[PDB]
Amino acid sequence: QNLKSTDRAVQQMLDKAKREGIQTVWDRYEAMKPQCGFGETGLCCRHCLQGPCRINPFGDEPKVGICGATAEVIVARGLDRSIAAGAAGHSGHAKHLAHTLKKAVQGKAASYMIKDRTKLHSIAKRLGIPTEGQKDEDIALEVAKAALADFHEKDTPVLWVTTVLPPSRVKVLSAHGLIPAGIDHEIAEIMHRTSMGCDADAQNLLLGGLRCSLADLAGCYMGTDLADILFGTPAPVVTESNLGVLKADAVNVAVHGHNPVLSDIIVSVSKEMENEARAAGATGINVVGICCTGNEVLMRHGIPACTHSVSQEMAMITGALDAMILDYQCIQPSVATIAECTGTTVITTMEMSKITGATHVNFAEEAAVENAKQILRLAIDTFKRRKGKPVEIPNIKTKVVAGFSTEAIINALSKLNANDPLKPLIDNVVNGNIRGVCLFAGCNNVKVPQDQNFTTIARKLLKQNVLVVATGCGAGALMRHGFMDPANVDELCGDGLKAVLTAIGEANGLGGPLPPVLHMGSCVDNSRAVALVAALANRLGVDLDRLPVVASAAEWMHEKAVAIGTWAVTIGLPTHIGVLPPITGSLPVTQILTSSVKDITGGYFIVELDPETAADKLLAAINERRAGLGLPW
Amino acid sequence: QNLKSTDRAVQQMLDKAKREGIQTVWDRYEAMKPQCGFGETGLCCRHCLQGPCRINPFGDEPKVGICGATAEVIVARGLDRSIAAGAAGHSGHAKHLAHTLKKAVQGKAASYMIKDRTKLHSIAKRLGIPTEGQKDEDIALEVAKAALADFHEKDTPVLWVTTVLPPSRVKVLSAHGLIPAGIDHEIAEIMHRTSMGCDADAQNLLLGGLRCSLADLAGCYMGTDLADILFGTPAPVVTESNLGVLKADAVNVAVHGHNPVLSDIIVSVSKEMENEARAAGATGINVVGICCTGNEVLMRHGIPACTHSVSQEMAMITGALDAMILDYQCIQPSVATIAECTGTTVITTMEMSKITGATHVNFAEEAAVENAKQILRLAIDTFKRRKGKPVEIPNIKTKVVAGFSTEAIINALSKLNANDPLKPLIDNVVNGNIRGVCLFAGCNNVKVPQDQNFTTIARKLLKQNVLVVATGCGAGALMRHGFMDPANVDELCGDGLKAVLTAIGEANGLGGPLPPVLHMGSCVDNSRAVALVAALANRLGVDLDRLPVVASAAEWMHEKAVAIGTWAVTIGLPTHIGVLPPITGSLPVTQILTSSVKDITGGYFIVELDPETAADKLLAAINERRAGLGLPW
Ligand code: SF4
Ligand code: SF4
Ligand code: FES
Ligand code: FES
């Protein structure tokens, strides 16, 4: 089971699932080998009914699609559609929050409100929305209307691109026509240009994809902005992660998916309903998090993370998981089947995200508290059905310090230098106590032993004094292996990194260092890391493609992560990817994405499947930037 | 060569290509067999990097995708993405025209203008735009702004859906939540819900697809509306089709693609440049049409159709084709390679539609006449390079009567009954001179001998007194085989259909009948057939799912046609498809699309690959509607 997952709680539940006969994601993967080489390399097209068309990676015919599409067109078209699909996910999430804020400040959804008035005012100021003399409700109404307006063409480009990056970066991107005109506009134009008998030039296609990845960036940043206004900007919190956060004696409720508009209410309402839970014989309601919506309520409220990504089924295998409350994105549809064996109530809540066999509760912001009570009563019913049964909850869990928004990080640094908070961080880069910054992002992937690339690369970078930040299931992996525990700084961090983490933590009254890895939130909260990097570039007066900053999608899976990986490159970052995207069937395309893009944006993809080699390549990339700034290394 | 194409001019050029060693679409198809059974049935998913996932149609594992996606989810998700891609094509075309009209009436593009003031006024009246007391420039500005506003969410639903269908049809669709909120909104929400770990319910997914097909409808209708305003509503025209419309002694220029904003200017400017052409030794400029943009300039100006769809390469094989001017959609990228052997100048003009190896001319409406002259000079240069060479133009061509817009058809009927023009058509339905109406739409497909299903089904329906109308390459197929020639009415049409076509034509001063098939325009002009059917339903006071009207995508290929086929079903039509979409790997989905959808919209798909059986099944469907109205049959 140790070739499946490096998580010990996960290995325990794999043994249970095996002997109970519950098929898992690793079983379904096994039943799928050997996988199709055509798809794996991207030499397959089904964009019309003359297809499917395949091209042999090597050898004789077929060498070309039926319409004449070459290998590089087919490969670039497929990649473009994954970027567009990822943008569509991050944009739908952000759109839903834009409507929720509009509804709230029009008096249409009283469960929702402007919780972070400071953030609302900086966002409105960043957008050129006038604040002085206006009600908060009116400023927020303007901000929501600007959010919705970035989805279509208008007099301006997408403001959640052009106002969040340094003007020098906006200029480099404009010169190549990469600035999105509208979020859903770019998504549609990609689907258009990649359909049969349209765009058939690899460079033209990939330039369209870079622009569409920036539409994804805009969706990510807008999602983070709106969630912070609605639900509070994260600040440092202490909690726990992994399966031992389940409690056999409580109604255990998992919030699972990506959009917190739902789960944040569940967190609030579940406290209300503790007495109703005690009456059925529970200690209370134990809300826990899965995937990125769990990270949302982890960053804001300190809700313990139960599990992530490829291993989500394992939470139900315990037999303790009474309800699993789903919005959308990255939910294995297998949970609906597996619940018939485990007793779990699987509840979908979102109109466009249903799973056959799951209970659906039609959630409306106008009725959020009504719906949350309805949902938590079903969980309480489910606990009663198992009241008495034996559960197997692995007694495994780690301590997690999280909540490192960009504002929290700046505030933390401001305790060493009140008037120039970025300077202490930069000073320690210059003198070498911080070699550079690495952002770990993205999913787990069944092809990679769970968390193996994340921890291996993280261990090597930290020993080399890299400041490591993390998001999404990359944060999930690092946290479940103790990387968000300050007590492991001594083991994990090099002396220079140790000193800076200790100096910052001691100055924030903790008598102890910051955690070895800074948890910056969910997948859309990759935009937080953009805000920090942009702030550092602006403070040093250079473009982002000169900073010693890199990214690692170490075990990535989802179309969202392809989009994220692609705008990481487009804003100027060397960007490591740990699972091959379907690109190797075309060397010209591979050459564009790993080398030639450097001359366009200054970022590039680093393809490397072996995590030790990946760490070396990421340190090289970081050290190359240091030398480019004239620093020692 | 007669198993490849039933077109004799096409068979001639296949012989030439064979002996000159030019590989063709049929050669590339041959080199691709046997095709992948997984893709062919829709049991293949590449929506994440854990994939590709395949499911065995029959037998043992794999039975399920790695994440747990079942066969019906995977199949429904793939179909949903093809509908979204088709909508994105039809919507991008319509969007480009909306901007062109905005630019024109703001004085920014003088080559463009309001050519059909009557149509502009009915459209504005249909939309609730006030006309009385307003300038045309201002009314048009309002119409363009409404067009652009149907792409995103607003206070109203998509008006190019809700104002073009009978209120009863809008009600049936609303009750199931099928009304699009915004065109690019639906495209994005489809890409969202079909991405990994989202919507996993076949019925929920397909309901999203029906709604997205209506976004495609809106794009089609908006494209037709704007093109008519900009370039004139078609009225009956006489011209010719097939390869013998090339002239060895002239500069032969093909307009190819779908968007006429470009080609309509070429038609105008090419007349200006005849003397420049004579100076190089040509008789003049011979502009001809390929695919749907050729149909556009065929409907409006009588430009001869040269060829269509699967056989477009064959135009270059003649050696006479000096330039091929491309916008986007359905252009085989092979033309860029084949031009190195034939001397043809292949010119792309659209920013998001480039082909490696082709000359690009950056077209701007602001500079249209400049660009057209630039492009036609390159054609004239190309004629000079071949001045003297032997060309092989098959001396094959048919007579084509076309230009049957819905307004032209109504005008034609108005000569038999001035105050109730639809009544003569309805009278002849009731008494049986017209059994019903069949709309042939969509592409050719290399899997089907070119035009074989179109002509076979057409022959059987016409003998049974079906009024047949046609669009896109279905019109292209029927016209190239003589079905737009009034001289074939006696051979082709049953006596009852013959009488009605003769009565209408004799009343329009032709001393002769209407053609055996009414050519209603390009693919977006399938919306014209909606307008006629809607007008007939409104005149009879029934919903569209009670009219003896059917559709045939007899040899369909493109994602656009999947979307078209799907909104044909969604507005209530029995809809025959002549090539299997990737749906047979899931019986539940197949059952929804061929039977169970009847209870939702009243339309349904008719899967039938044998054209004689298809004709029988379409007559059955038509006769079932007749009986439902109480008519004889
Ligand atoms: S678009 Fe081209 S390569 Fe793709 S399936 Fe159609 S014919 Fe084959
Ligand atoms: S979404 Fe599911 S079925 Fe599709 S590739 Fe990913 S794991 Fe396989
Ligand atoms: S042929 Fe296997 S992925 Fe297409
Ligand atoms: S395995 Fe062949 S189409 Fe996917």
PDB file of N, CA and C in Angstrom, chain A residues 28 32 35 44 46 49-52 54 66-67 81 95 99 153 185 192 195-197 199-201 204 329-331 333 351-352 354 356 446-447 557-559, chain B residues 28 32 35 44 46 49-52 54 66-67 81 95 99 153 185 192 195-197 199-201 204 329-331 333 351-352 354 356 446-447 557-559:
ATOM      1  N   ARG A  28      -9.192   1.246  -9.522  1.00  0.00           N
ATOM      2  CA  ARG A  28      -9.691   1.603 -10.846  1.00  0.00           C
ATOM      3  C   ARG A  28      -8.538   1.978 -11.766  1.00  0.00           C
ATOM      4  N   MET A  32      -7.032  -0.064 -15.262  1.00  0.00           N
ATOM      5  CA  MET A  32      -6.991   0.727 -16.481  1.00  0.00           C
ATOM      6  C   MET A  32      -5.678   0.570 -17.232  1.00  0.00           C
ATOM      7  N   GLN A  35      -2.222   2.144 -20.037  1.00  0.00           N
ATOM      8  CA  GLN A  35      -3.042   3.217 -20.565  1.00  0.00           C
ATOM      9  C   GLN A  35      -2.663   3.508 -22.015  1.00  0.00           C
ATOM     10  N   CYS A  44      -4.034  12.432 -30.166  1.00  0.00           N
ATOM     11  CA  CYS A  44      -5.384  11.926 -30.380  1.00  0.00           C
ATOM     12  C   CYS A  44      -6.337  13.105 -30.393  1.00  0.00           C
ATOM     13  N   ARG A  46     -10.611  14.102 -31.132  1.00  0.00           N
ATOM     14  CA  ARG A  46     -12.002  13.716 -31.355  1.00  0.00           C
ATOM     15  C   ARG A  46     -12.863  14.951 -31.585  1.00  0.00           C
ATOM     16  N   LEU A  49     -16.614  14.293 -36.147  1.00  0.00           N
ATOM     17  CA  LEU A  49     -17.136  12.939 -36.302  1.00  0.00           C
ATOM     18  C   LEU A  49     -16.453  12.174 -37.420  1.00  0.00           C
ATOM     19  N   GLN A  50     -15.520  12.801 -38.130  1.00  0.00           N
ATOM     20  CA  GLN A  50     -14.618  12.008 -38.951  1.00  0.00           C
ATOM     21  C   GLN A  50     -13.634  11.224 -38.088  1.00  0.00           C
ATOM     22  N   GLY A  51     -13.359  11.696 -36.869  1.00  0.00           N
ATOM     23  CA  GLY A  51     -12.434  11.043 -35.966  1.00  0.00           C
ATOM     24  C   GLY A  51     -13.025   9.776 -35.364  1.00  0.00           C
ATOM     25  N   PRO A  52     -12.382   9.211 -34.326  1.00  0.00           N
ATOM     26  CA  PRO A  52     -11.168   9.734 -33.695  1.00  0.00           C
ATOM     27  C   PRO A  52      -9.944   9.561 -34.579  1.00  0.00           C
ATOM     28  N   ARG A  54      -5.813   9.444 -34.566  1.00  0.00           N
ATOM     29  CA  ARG A  54      -4.613   9.254 -33.784  1.00  0.00           C
ATOM     30  C   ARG A  54      -3.434   9.437 -34.722  1.00  0.00           C
ATOM     31  N   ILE A  66      -7.213  13.320 -40.126  1.00  0.00           N
ATOM     32  CA  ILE A  66      -7.931  13.107 -41.384  1.00  0.00           C
ATOM     33  C   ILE A  66      -8.094  14.415 -42.147  1.00  0.00           C
ATOM     34  N   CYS A  67      -8.320  15.523 -41.434  1.00  0.00           N
ATOM     35  CA  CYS A  67      -8.467  16.828 -42.074  1.00  0.00           C
ATOM     36  C   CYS A  67      -7.133  17.460 -42.445  1.00  0.00           C
ATOM     37  N   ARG A  81      -7.667  23.447 -24.924  1.00  0.00           N
ATOM     38  CA  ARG A  81      -8.988  23.157 -24.376  1.00  0.00           C
ATOM     39  C   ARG A  81      -8.934  22.854 -22.880  1.00  0.00           C
ATOM     40  N   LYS A  95     -17.495  33.728 -10.384  1.00  0.00           N
ATOM     41  CA  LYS A  95     -18.792  34.268 -10.790  1.00  0.00           C
ATOM     42  C   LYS A  95     -19.851  34.034  -9.722  1.00  0.00           C
ATOM     43  N   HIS A  99     -22.075  37.022  -7.748  1.00  0.00           N
ATOM     44  CA  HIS A  99     -23.527  37.104  -7.575  1.00  0.00           C
ATOM     45  C   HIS A  99     -23.920  37.076  -6.096  1.00  0.00           C
ATOM     46  N   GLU A 153     -16.561  41.172 -23.118  1.00  0.00           N
ATOM     47  CA  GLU A 153     -15.894  42.332 -23.703  1.00  0.00           C
ATOM     48  C   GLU A 153     -16.539  43.632 -23.226  1.00  0.00           C
ATOM     49  N   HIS A 185     -15.355  35.221 -22.632  1.00  0.00           N
ATOM     50  CA  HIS A 185     -14.960  35.495 -24.008  1.00  0.00           C
ATOM     51  C   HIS A 185     -13.748  34.663 -24.429  1.00  0.00           C
ATOM     52  N   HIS A 192     -13.719  27.857 -29.896  1.00  0.00           N
ATOM     53  CA  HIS A 192     -13.872  28.167 -31.316  1.00  0.00           C
ATOM     54  C   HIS A 192     -12.615  27.805 -32.105  1.00  0.00           C
ATOM     55  N   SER A 195     -11.678  24.044 -32.632  1.00  0.00           N
ATOM     56  CA  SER A 195     -12.633  23.165 -33.279  1.00  0.00           C
ATOM     57  C   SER A 195     -12.197  22.922 -34.730  1.00  0.00           C
ATOM     58  N   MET A 196     -12.787  21.908 -35.371  1.00  0.00           N
ATOM     59  CA  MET A 196     -12.230  21.435 -36.642  1.00  0.00           C
ATOM     60  C   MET A 196     -12.194  22.565 -37.666  1.00  0.00           C
ATOM     61  N   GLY A 197     -11.100  22.628 -38.427  1.00  0.00           N
ATOM     62  CA  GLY A 197     -11.031  23.515 -39.577  1.00  0.00           C
ATOM     63  C   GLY A 197     -10.827  24.981 -39.257  1.00  0.00           C
ATOM     64  N   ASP A 199      -8.033  27.534 -36.404  1.00  0.00           N
ATOM     65  CA  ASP A 199      -6.614  27.713 -36.082  1.00  0.00           C
ATOM     66  C   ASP A 199      -5.789  26.435 -36.227  1.00  0.00           C
ATOM     67  N   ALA A 200      -4.743  26.500 -37.063  1.00  0.00           N
ATOM     68  CA  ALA A 200      -3.865  25.355 -37.333  1.00  0.00           C
ATOM     69  C   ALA A 200      -2.400  25.792 -37.368  1.00  0.00           C
ATOM     70  N   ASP A 201      -1.992  26.588 -36.386  1.00  0.00           N
ATOM     71  CA  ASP A 201      -0.604  27.012 -36.242  1.00  0.00           C
ATOM     72  C   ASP A 201      -0.234  26.900 -34.768  1.00  0.00           C
ATOM     73  N   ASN A 204       0.475  30.174 -32.934  1.00  0.00           N
ATOM     74  CA  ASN A 204      -0.746  30.969 -32.820  1.00  0.00           C
ATOM     75  C   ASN A 204      -1.666  30.376 -31.767  1.00  0.00           C
ATOM     76  N   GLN A 329     -16.188  20.394  -8.318  1.00  0.00           N
ATOM     77  CA  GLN A 329     -14.768  20.317  -8.666  1.00  0.00           C
ATOM     78  C   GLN A 329     -14.001  19.305  -7.809  1.00  0.00           C
ATOM     79  N   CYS A 330     -13.337  18.353  -8.473  1.00  0.00           N
ATOM     80  CA  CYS A 330     -12.398  17.411  -7.865  1.00  0.00           C
ATOM     81  C   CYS A 330     -13.060  16.400  -6.934  1.00  0.00           C
ATOM     82  N   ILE A 331     -14.379  16.258  -7.002  1.00  0.00           N
ATOM     83  CA  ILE A 331     -15.099  15.238  -6.244  1.00  0.00           C
ATOM     84  C   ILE A 331     -15.131  13.961  -7.068  1.00  0.00           C
ATOM     85  N   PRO A 333     -16.654  10.909  -8.416  1.00  0.00           N
ATOM     86  CA  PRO A 333     -18.066  10.475  -8.401  1.00  0.00           C
ATOM     87  C   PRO A 333     -18.255   9.136  -7.732  1.00  0.00           C
ATOM     88  N   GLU A 351     -26.654  23.215  -8.579  1.00  0.00           N
ATOM     89  CA  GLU A 351     -27.516  22.836  -9.696  1.00  0.00           C
ATOM     90  C   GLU A 351     -26.748  22.104 -10.796  1.00  0.00           C
ATOM     91  N   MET A 352     -25.566  22.607 -11.175  1.00  0.00           N
ATOM     92  CA  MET A 352     -24.842  22.020 -12.295  1.00  0.00           C
ATOM     93  C   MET A 352     -23.841  20.958 -11.879  1.00  0.00           C
ATOM     94  N   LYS A 354     -24.352  17.450 -10.010  1.00  0.00           N
ATOM     95  CA  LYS A 354     -25.076  16.339  -9.403  1.00  0.00           C
ATOM     96  C   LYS A 354     -24.382  15.009  -9.698  1.00  0.00           C
ATOM     97  N   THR A 356     -25.372  10.852  -9.724  1.00  0.00           N
ATOM     98  CA  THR A 356     -26.399   9.823  -9.603  1.00  0.00           C
ATOM     99  C   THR A 356     -26.186   9.018  -8.326  1.00  0.00           C
ATOM    100  N   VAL A 446      -3.103   9.822  -9.194  1.00  0.00           N
ATOM    101  CA  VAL A 446      -3.011   8.396  -8.889  1.00  0.00           C
ATOM    102  C   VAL A 446      -1.752   7.756  -9.474  1.00  0.00           C
ATOM    103  N   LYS A 447      -1.174   8.349 -10.522  1.00  0.00           N
ATOM    104  CA  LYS A 447       0.054   7.830 -11.123  1.00  0.00           C
ATOM    105  C   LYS A 447       1.265   8.011 -10.210  1.00  0.00           C
ATOM    106  N   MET A 557      -3.058  17.181 -11.734  1.00  0.00           N
ATOM    107  CA  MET A 557      -4.044  16.302 -12.351  1.00  0.00           C
ATOM    108  C   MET A 557      -5.114  17.042 -13.158  1.00  0.00           C
ATOM    109  N   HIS A 558      -5.624  18.129 -12.607  1.00  0.00           N
ATOM    110  CA  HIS A 558      -6.869  18.713 -13.066  1.00  0.00           C
ATOM    111  C   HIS A 558      -6.604  19.730 -14.165  1.00  0.00           C
ATOM    112  N   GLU A 559      -7.625  19.945 -14.996  1.00  0.00           N
ATOM    113  CA  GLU A 559      -7.553  20.987 -16.013  1.00  0.00           C
ATOM    114  C   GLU A 559      -7.299  22.361 -15.390  1.00  0.00           C
TER     115      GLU A 559
ATOM    116  N   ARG B  28      -5.914  10.193 -46.249  1.00  0.00           N
ATOM    117  CA  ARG B  28      -5.594  10.296 -44.829  1.00  0.00           C
ATOM    118  C   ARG B  28      -6.574   9.476 -44.002  1.00  0.00           C
ATOM    119  N   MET B  32      -5.891   5.898 -41.680  1.00  0.00           N
ATOM    120  CA  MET B  32      -6.272   5.978 -40.279  1.00  0.00           C
ATOM    121  C   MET B  32      -7.048   4.754 -39.817  1.00  0.00           C
ATOM    122  N   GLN B  35     -10.270   2.582 -37.136  1.00  0.00           N
ATOM    123  CA  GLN B  35     -10.286   3.654 -36.160  1.00  0.00           C
ATOM    124  C   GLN B  35     -10.561   3.096 -34.765  1.00  0.00           C
ATOM    125  N   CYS B  44     -14.242   7.150 -23.904  1.00  0.00           N
ATOM    126  CA  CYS B  44     -12.876   7.614 -23.699  1.00  0.00           C
ATOM    127  C   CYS B  44     -12.930   9.024 -23.145  1.00  0.00           C
ATOM    128  N   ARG B  46     -10.290  12.222 -21.530  1.00  0.00           N
ATOM    129  CA  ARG B  46      -8.970  12.790 -21.269  1.00  0.00           C
ATOM    130  C   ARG B  46      -9.100  14.102 -20.507  1.00  0.00           C
ATOM    131  N   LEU B  49      -5.252  14.509 -15.998  1.00  0.00           N
ATOM    132  CA  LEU B  49      -3.959  13.882 -16.256  1.00  0.00           C
ATOM    133  C   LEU B  49      -3.818  12.532 -15.579  1.00  0.00           C
ATOM    134  N   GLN B  50      -4.826  12.098 -14.830  1.00  0.00           N
ATOM    135  CA  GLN B  50      -4.872  10.689 -14.468  1.00  0.00           C
ATOM    136  C   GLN B  50      -5.212   9.822 -15.677  1.00  0.00           C
ATOM    137  N   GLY B  51      -5.891  10.386 -16.679  1.00  0.00           N
ATOM    138  CA  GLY B  51      -6.279   9.659 -17.870  1.00  0.00           C
ATOM    139  C   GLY B  51      -5.094   9.402 -18.790  1.00  0.00           C
ATOM    140  N   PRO B  52      -5.348   8.966 -20.038  1.00  0.00           N
ATOM    141  CA  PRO B  52      -6.680   8.747 -20.605  1.00  0.00           C
ATOM    142  C   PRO B  52      -7.360   7.524 -20.012  1.00  0.00           C
ATOM    143  N   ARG B  54     -10.369   4.759 -20.627  1.00  0.00           N
ATOM    144  CA  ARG B  54     -11.247   4.123 -21.582  1.00  0.00           C
ATOM    145  C   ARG B  54     -12.119   3.150 -20.809  1.00  0.00           C
ATOM    146  N   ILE B  66     -11.093   6.337 -13.928  1.00  0.00           N
ATOM    147  CA  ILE B  66     -10.247   6.222 -12.739  1.00  0.00           C
ATOM    148  C   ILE B  66     -10.874   6.943 -11.552  1.00  0.00           C
ATOM    149  N   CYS B  67     -11.523   8.085 -11.795  1.00  0.00           N
ATOM    150  CA  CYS B  67     -12.177   8.836 -10.726  1.00  0.00           C
ATOM    151  C   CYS B  67     -13.534   8.263 -10.343  1.00  0.00           C
ATOM    152  N   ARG B  81     -19.420  18.766 -24.419  1.00  0.00           N
ATOM    153  CA  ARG B  81     -18.320  19.623 -24.849  1.00  0.00           C
ATOM    154  C   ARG B  81     -18.367  19.906 -26.349  1.00  0.00           C
ATOM    155  N   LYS B  95     -20.761  37.173 -32.967  1.00  0.00           N
ATOM    156  CA  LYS B  95     -20.090  38.240 -32.225  1.00  0.00           C
ATOM    157  C   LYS B  95     -19.293  39.146 -33.153  1.00  0.00           C
ATOM    158  N   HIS B  99     -19.847  43.297 -33.637  1.00  0.00           N
ATOM    159  CA  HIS B  99     -18.840  44.358 -33.571  1.00  0.00           C
ATOM    160  C   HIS B  99     -18.731  45.112 -34.897  1.00  0.00           C
ATOM    161  N   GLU B 153     -24.575  37.126 -18.688  1.00  0.00           N
ATOM    162  CA  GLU B 153     -25.749  37.269 -17.831  1.00  0.00           C
ATOM    163  C   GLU B 153     -26.180  38.731 -17.731  1.00  0.00           C
ATOM    164  N   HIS B 185     -21.664  32.504 -21.383  1.00  0.00           N
ATOM    165  CA  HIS B 185     -21.951  31.950 -20.065  1.00  0.00           C
ATOM    166  C   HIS B 185     -22.255  30.453 -20.130  1.00  0.00           C
ATOM    167  N   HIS B 192     -17.100  23.941 -17.445  1.00  0.00           N
ATOM    168  CA  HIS B 192     -16.994  23.752 -16.000  1.00  0.00           C
ATOM    169  C   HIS B 192     -17.589  22.414 -15.566  1.00  0.00           C
ATOM    170  N   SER B 195     -15.767  19.086 -16.520  1.00  0.00           N
ATOM    171  CA  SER B 195     -14.393  18.891 -16.096  1.00  0.00           C
ATOM    172  C   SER B 195     -14.363  17.936 -14.896  1.00  0.00           C
ATOM    173  N   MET B 196     -13.174  17.414 -14.576  1.00  0.00           N
ATOM    174  CA  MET B 196     -13.109  16.289 -13.639  1.00  0.00           C
ATOM    175  C   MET B 196     -13.733  16.668 -12.299  1.00  0.00           C
ATOM    176  N   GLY B 197     -14.487  15.731 -11.721  1.00  0.00           N
ATOM    177  CA  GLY B 197     -14.960  15.881 -10.354  1.00  0.00           C
ATOM    178  C   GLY B 197     -16.111  16.848 -10.166  1.00  0.00           C
ATOM    179  N   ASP B 199     -20.248  17.744 -12.299  1.00  0.00           N
ATOM    180  CA  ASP B 199     -21.467  17.053 -12.728  1.00  0.00           C
ATOM    181  C   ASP B 199     -21.230  15.603 -13.152  1.00  0.00           C
ATOM    182  N   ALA B 200     -21.940  14.674 -12.497  1.00  0.00           N
ATOM    183  CA  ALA B 200     -21.812  13.236 -12.767  1.00  0.00           C
ATOM    184  C   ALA B 200     -23.186  12.565 -12.781  1.00  0.00           C
ATOM    185  N   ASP B 201     -24.142  13.178 -13.469  1.00  0.00           N
ATOM    186  CA  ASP B 201     -25.475  12.609 -13.642  1.00  0.00           C
ATOM    187  C   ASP B 201     -25.877  12.808 -15.099  1.00  0.00           C
ATOM    188  N   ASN B 204     -28.790  15.191 -15.750  1.00  0.00           N
ATOM    189  CA  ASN B 204     -28.412  16.562 -15.412  1.00  0.00           C
ATOM    190  C   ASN B 204     -27.482  17.130 -16.470  1.00  0.00           C
ATOM    191  N   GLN B 329     -13.330  28.065 -39.720  1.00  0.00           N
ATOM    192  CA  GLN B 329     -14.293  26.966 -39.618  1.00  0.00           C
ATOM    193  C   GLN B 329     -14.323  26.085 -40.870  1.00  0.00           C
ATOM    194  N   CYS B 330     -14.108  24.779 -40.678  1.00  0.00           N
ATOM    195  CA  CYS B 330     -14.278  23.745 -41.699  1.00  0.00           C
ATOM    196  C   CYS B 330     -13.252  23.822 -42.825  1.00  0.00           C
ATOM    197  N   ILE B 331     -12.166  24.562 -42.632  1.00  0.00           N
ATOM    198  CA  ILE B 331     -11.067  24.608 -43.593  1.00  0.00           C
ATOM    199  C   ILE B 331     -10.099  23.482 -43.272  1.00  0.00           C
ATOM    200  N   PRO B 333      -6.791  21.947 -42.881  1.00  0.00           N
ATOM    201  CA  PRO B 333      -5.456  22.581 -42.855  1.00  0.00           C
ATOM    202  C   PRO B 333      -4.534  22.036 -43.918  1.00  0.00           C
ATOM    203  N   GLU B 351      -7.322  36.692 -37.068  1.00  0.00           N
ATOM    204  CA  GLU B 351      -6.280  36.608 -36.048  1.00  0.00           C
ATOM    205  C   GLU B 351      -6.226  35.230 -35.389  1.00  0.00           C
ATOM    206  N   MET B 352      -7.385  34.666 -35.022  1.00  0.00           N
ATOM    207  CA  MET B 352      -7.390  33.409 -34.288  1.00  0.00           C
ATOM    208  C   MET B 352      -7.502  32.186 -35.181  1.00  0.00           C
ATOM    209  N   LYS B 354      -5.089  30.810 -38.070  1.00  0.00           N
ATOM    210  CA  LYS B 354      -3.908  30.746 -38.923  1.00  0.00           C
ATOM    211  C   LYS B 354      -3.519  29.295 -39.208  1.00  0.00           C
ATOM    212  N   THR B 356      -0.069  27.132 -40.502  1.00  0.00           N
ATOM    213  CA  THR B 356       1.352  27.151 -40.834  1.00  0.00           C
ATOM    214  C   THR B 356       1.544  26.916 -42.329  1.00  0.00           C
ATOM    215  N   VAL B 446     -16.091  12.116 -44.384  1.00  0.00           N
ATOM    216  CA  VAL B 446     -15.272  11.202 -45.178  1.00  0.00           C
ATOM    217  C   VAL B 446     -15.715   9.746 -45.030  1.00  0.00           C
ATOM    218  N   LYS B 447     -16.390   9.403 -43.930  1.00  0.00           N
ATOM    219  CA  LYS B 447     -16.886   8.044 -43.722  1.00  0.00           C
ATOM    220  C   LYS B 447     -18.032   7.695 -44.670  1.00  0.00           C
ATOM    221  N   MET B 557     -20.572  16.154 -39.464  1.00  0.00           N
ATOM    222  CA  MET B 557     -19.180  15.989 -39.064  1.00  0.00           C
ATOM    223  C   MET B 557     -18.754  16.902 -37.912  1.00  0.00           C
ATOM    224  N   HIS B 558     -19.157  18.159 -37.974  1.00  0.00           N
ATOM    225  CA  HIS B 558     -18.545  19.203 -37.174  1.00  0.00           C
ATOM    226  C   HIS B 558     -19.256  19.330 -35.836  1.00  0.00           C
ATOM    227  N   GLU B 559     -18.520  19.850 -34.852  1.00  0.00           N
ATOM    228  CA  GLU B 559     -19.115  20.149 -33.555  1.00  0.00           C
ATOM    229  C   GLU B 559     -20.285  21.127 -33.687  1.00  0.00           C
TER     230      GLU B 559
END
